[PDB]
Coordinates of C-alpha atoms and ligand atoms in Angstrom, one line a residue:
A610 CA -31.4 26.0 -17.1
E611 CA -32.4 23.7 -14.3
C612 CA -29.6 21.4 -13.3
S613 CA -31.1 19.5 -10.4
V614 CA -34.2 17.4 -9.7
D615 CA -36.0 16.4 -6.5
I616 CA -37.2 12.8 -6.5
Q617 CA -39.1 10.8 -3.9
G618 CA -39.2 7.1 -3.1
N619 CA -42.2 6.2 -0.9
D620 CA -43.5 3.4 1.3
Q621 CA -45.4 2.0 -1.7
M622 CA -42.2 1.1 -3.6
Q623 CA -42.5 3.9 -6.1
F624 CA -40.5 6.9 -7.3
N625 CA -42.7 9.9 -8.0
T626 CA -41.4 10.3 -11.6
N627 CA -40.4 7.9 -14.4
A628 CA -38.4 10.5 -16.4
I629 CA -35.7 13.0 -15.6
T630 CA -34.3 15.5 -18.1
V631 CA -30.8 16.9 -17.9
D632 CA -30.5 20.2 -19.8
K633 CA -27.7 20.0 -22.3
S634 CA -26.1 23.1 -20.9
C635 CA -25.6 21.6 -17.4
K636 CA -22.0 20.7 -16.6
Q637 CA -23.1 19.1 -13.3
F638 CA -26.4 17.7 -12.2
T639 CA -27.7 17.0 -8.7
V640 CA -30.4 14.5 -7.7
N641 CA -32.0 15.2 -4.3
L642 CA -33.6 11.9 -3.2
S643 CA -36.1 11.8 -0.2
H644 CA -38.3 9.2 1.3
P645 CA -41.8 10.3 2.3
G646 CA -43.7 7.9 4.4
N647 CA -42.8 6.0 7.6
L648 CA -41.1 2.8 6.8
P649 CA -37.5 2.7 7.9
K650 CA -34.5 1.6 5.7
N651 CA -34.4 -1.9 7.0
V652 CA -38.0 -2.4 5.7
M653 CA -38.3 -0.1 2.7
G654 CA -35.1 1.6 2.0
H655 CA -34.4 3.2 -1.4
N656 CA -31.5 4.5 -3.4
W657 CA -31.1 6.1 -6.8
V658 CA -28.6 4.6 -9.3
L659 CA -27.8 5.7 -12.8
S660 CA -26.5 3.6 -15.7
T661 CA -27.1 3.3 -19.4
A662 CA -30.4 1.4 -20.3
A663 CA -28.2 -1.3 -21.9
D664 CA -26.3 -1.8 -18.6
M665 CA -29.2 -1.8 -16.2
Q666 CA -29.9 -5.5 -16.1
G667 CA -26.2 -6.4 -15.8
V668 CA -25.8 -3.9 -12.9
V669 CA -28.8 -5.4 -11.2
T670 CA -27.6 -9.1 -11.7
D671 CA -24.2 -8.4 -10.3
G672 CA -25.8 -6.3 -7.5
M673 CA -28.1 -9.1 -6.5
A674 CA -25.1 -11.3 -6.3
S675 CA -23.3 -8.7 -4.1
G676 CA -26.3 -8.5 -1.7
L677 CA -27.7 -6.5 1.2
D678 CA -24.2 -6.0 2.5
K679 CA -23.4 -3.8 -0.5
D680 CA -26.8 -2.1 -1.0
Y681 CA -27.2 -4.5 -4.0
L682 CA -24.5 -2.9 -6.1
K683 CA -21.2 -4.4 -7.1
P684 CA -18.6 -2.2 -5.5
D685 CA -16.8 0.0 -8.0
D686 CA -19.0 -1.2 -10.9
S687 CA -17.8 0.9 -13.8
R688 CA -21.3 0.8 -15.3
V689 CA -22.7 2.8 -12.4
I690 CA -22.5 6.5 -13.4
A691 CA -23.7 7.8 -10.0
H692 CA -25.6 6.6 -7.0
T693 CA -27.0 7.8 -3.7
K694 CA -26.9 6.1 -0.3
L695 CA -29.8 3.9 0.8
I696 CA -32.4 6.0 2.8
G697 CA -35.4 5.2 5.0
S698 CA -38.4 7.3 5.7
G699 CA -37.6 10.9 6.8
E700 CA -34.0 10.6 5.5
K701 CA -32.5 12.2 2.4
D702 CA -29.5 12.1 0.2
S703 CA -28.1 14.0 -2.8
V704 CA -25.7 13.0 -5.4
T705 CA -24.1 15.2 -8.0
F706 CA -22.4 14.1 -11.2
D707 CA -20.5 15.5 -14.1
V708 CA -22.7 15.7 -17.2
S709 CA -19.5 15.0 -19.2
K710 CA -20.2 11.3 -18.2
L711 CA -23.4 11.4 -20.3
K712 CA -23.4 11.4 -24.1
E713 CA -26.2 13.1 -26.3
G714 CA -27.4 9.9 -28.2
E715 CA -27.3 7.4 -25.4
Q716 CA -30.3 6.3 -23.2
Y717 CA -29.8 6.3 -19.5
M718 CA -31.9 4.8 -16.8
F719 CA -32.2 5.3 -13.1
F720 CA -33.4 2.8 -10.6
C721 CA -33.5 1.6 -7.0
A722 CA -30.9 -1.2 -6.5
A723 CA -33.0 -2.6 -3.6
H724 CA -36.2 -2.6 -5.7
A725 CA -35.1 -2.8 -9.4
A726 CA -38.8 -2.5 -10.5
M727 CA -38.5 1.2 -9.4
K728 CA -37.1 2.8 -12.5
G729 CA -37.3 5.6 -15.1
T730 CA -35.3 7.2 -17.8
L731 CA -32.8 10.0 -17.8
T732 CA -32.1 11.9 -21.0
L733 CA -29.9 14.8 -22.1
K734 CA -32.2 17.5 -23.6
Ligands
CU1_2073 CU1 -36.3 1.1 -3.5

């Protein structure tokens, strides 16, 4: 089984995939985020945030209210399963999480908290 994924967020405000699969045998899973391009984090920074699909809008709303000062996430938001730091071009960050925090029948989504239009699904498979 493959228990990690490499994902890119670019200067054009896009991730390079809209779907991540976590093999059901994985006990931990690592997301390796990078930022091709040349725009720095104070212009086009990206992170990677994981919640259930049902919780995404709520996380975004409360994140918006929390602002730039908090990378647009409510600190300690229990709905946020895992998240990376905000990165600019040429920078990278990885986050690892316990797959026990995921459930087989539930739908998850990942997104950038700075640019909530940048999103995709994450599924146990
Ligand atoms: Cu972003």
